[PDB]
Amino acid sequence: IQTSEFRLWSIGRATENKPRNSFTLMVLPIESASRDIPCIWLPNEDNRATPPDVMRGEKIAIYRLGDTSQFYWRSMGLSNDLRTLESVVYTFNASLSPGGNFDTCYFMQFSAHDKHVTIGTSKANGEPYRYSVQINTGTGAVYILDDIGNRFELVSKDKRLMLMNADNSFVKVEKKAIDLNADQYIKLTSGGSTLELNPTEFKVNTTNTTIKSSGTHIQEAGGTMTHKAGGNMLFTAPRYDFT
Amino acid sequence: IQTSEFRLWSIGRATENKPRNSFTLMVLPIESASRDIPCIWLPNEDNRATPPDVMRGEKIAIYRLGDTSQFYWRSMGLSNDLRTLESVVYTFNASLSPGGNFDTCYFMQFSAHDKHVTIGTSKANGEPYRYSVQINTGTGAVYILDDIGNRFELVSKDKRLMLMNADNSFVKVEKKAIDLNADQYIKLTSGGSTLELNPTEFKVNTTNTTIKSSGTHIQEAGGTMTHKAGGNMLFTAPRYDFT
Amino acid sequence: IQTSEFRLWSIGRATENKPRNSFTLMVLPIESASRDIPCIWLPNEDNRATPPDVMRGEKIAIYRLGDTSQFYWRSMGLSNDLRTLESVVYTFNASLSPGGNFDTCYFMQFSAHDKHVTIGTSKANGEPYRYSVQINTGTGAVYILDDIGNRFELVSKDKRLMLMNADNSFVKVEKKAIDLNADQYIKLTSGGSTLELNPTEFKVNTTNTTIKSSGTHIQEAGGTMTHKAGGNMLFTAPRYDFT
Ligand SMILES: [Cl-]
Ligand SMILES: [Cl-]
Ligand SMILES: [Cl-]
Ligand SMILES: [Cl-]
Ligand SMILES: [Cl-]
Ligand SMILES: [Cl-]
Ligand SMILES: [Cl-]
Ligand SMILES: [Cl-]
Ligand SMILES: [Cl-]
Ligand SMILES: [Cl-]
Ligand SMILES: [Cl-]
Ligand SMILES: [Cl-]
Ligand SMILES: [Cl-]
Ligand SMILES: [Cl-]
Ligand SMILES: [Cl-]
Ligand code: NA
Ligand code: NA
Ligand code: NA
Ligand code: NA
Ligand code: NA
Ligand code: NA
Ligand code: NA
């Protein structure tokens, strides 16, 4: 019966917490047939760039190639209740040349250590822009952004939701205030009616205009001021004063 | 040739649909060497909290530790066309103490049963806020929100997209209407020109103001009304009436 | 010692780049005990619909059922540095009937080949709407949309962020301009003050109105124009002209 020389050699227990940036795991074999074995990571799945953040005492499957010193460790997924901080990166390469820092792959990263969840893309295959969808749990924010300045923003400590583009035009909802900003113009359109604000003008073009102030009304011009009516012009007040 | 006592014992077939909240699976061994075996879940991958939603008749790999009664079941991924409703939770623990309801982990959940896709974070390691990015397929919505009231919203039955913060400031795009609301002020800025609306004021500060009405123009003040011009003030109408 | 007839038969090397839409992989066994073997995909994990985009020379585990011609290939995850373009689809079925094009499942897809990252849902189990959260790296955009016209948009080449609903109401932030559009009305609310624009009206209802123009002020009506003040009406200018 032909069987590969590469086989499950012994069930084991991790003797140490795997260091975050390490692929080696010290494992103690616990089957009756120093005492630790330095094992190389054997992934449970493809497209996972980081080994599991194995804690001391987790059940580990130790694989061995024949009688050689090539030992491998595979997480068995039976000791999840031991996990503390976990950071996992799933990578999907996006370059014609192989080899590879996330510069040549699309990825999704859950990092408790660095306190973010991020989906990011790369510019290694003709893509014009890079993107990131990030939940930043450290500062407290959700971002949707490219690499040229366009950004959706939810920032919790400032109670801010914002639509911001690369030209500093934005719609900002921060606390009890809303701020719109645009260097060329801001225009409201409803049917045939328009209201525009631009660096030199405030323009309204509509059918009927009604400006009601329960208190005072003030309109002041540094230059000339014109009132024009195709129909009758009406003034109603207890008295009229011309300075 | 040393080999672990823990080995693939027999290929089998699931005899029942696995109940959603169960880790045990009844499996019938189908290799010639009651008839069902209660098996414990053996995961194919780490960071998966839920066993596959195995349907009756799926090919199952039955593992066994030596001659003991410890039987384990592993989905082989060769019977995907039998799947009906699936709910899968990937968890990434985010607490210094181990052990663990999603209160101590970042996670991503695809649930056909509960009709949502959700990416959520936890507040178990000093994070100031929790977050959720949810596609709610039951009610019909996409949400981006924290746990204090800041929210992006796409709600389909109401044709609503909204930016809403914890102070009830919002930019609402619902059906054929747009509503902006902010308790302190709403300000539009374009260059040196500003338009502000606040609880007691409507203020415009610009260079040139043009208000054209194809129909009627009405401005009414409960108190005083002042017209001021540094240059000539012009009135043009077929007739003028002072009440 | 009972062991399944289905076992790891030999470690091997992929002889060819797996074609994107293929489940078969030509593998050369490299254990001493034509020369290629057509193997069927054996997944490393459940809920993965696409086999890994295996490149020539990757280490492959060849499984075999007994002495039969049923050979299977499993990616070992030890040759990731050979990956070039990768497209991976994780599927989560969402239909009461089994069987299945993404029409009956929720899914998440990372595709370097087609240049997008997409989370999508289906309408096979009573869901009223389908959804997609897509990073389109080809055109350069992030979309959040349903299947009836509601859409959040980040489009990089146009420097556009937009909230757009099925009735063509939108808040558009494009380059140096902001455009709001709504067929019924656009209303700003701050406390008791309101500013509304609708197809026939421009309405302001506030306490105090101040319209300051450093240059000229023009208000023109095709019909009548009325000025009403409950208090004194004041005119201040170097001279007044009635046409
Ligand atoms: Cl290492
Ligand atoms: Cl793994
Ligand atoms: Cl080697
Ligand atoms: Cl990379
Ligand atoms: Cl501001
Ligand atoms: Cl159970
Ligand atoms: Cl599994
Ligand atoms: Cl046990
Ligand atoms: Cl938890
Ligand atoms: Cl409202
Ligand atoms: Cl095929
Ligand atoms: Cl796989
Ligand atoms: Cl078969
Ligand atoms: Cl499908
Ligand atoms: Cl427009
Ligand atoms: Na890690
Ligand atoms: Na301000
Ligand atoms: Na696996
Ligand atoms: Na489930
Ligand atoms: Na309303
Ligand atoms: Na592929
Ligand atoms: Na325009």
UniProtKB/TrEMBL annotation, chains A, B, C:
It comes from the Viruses. This is PHIKZ164. It comes from Pseudomonas phage phiKZ.
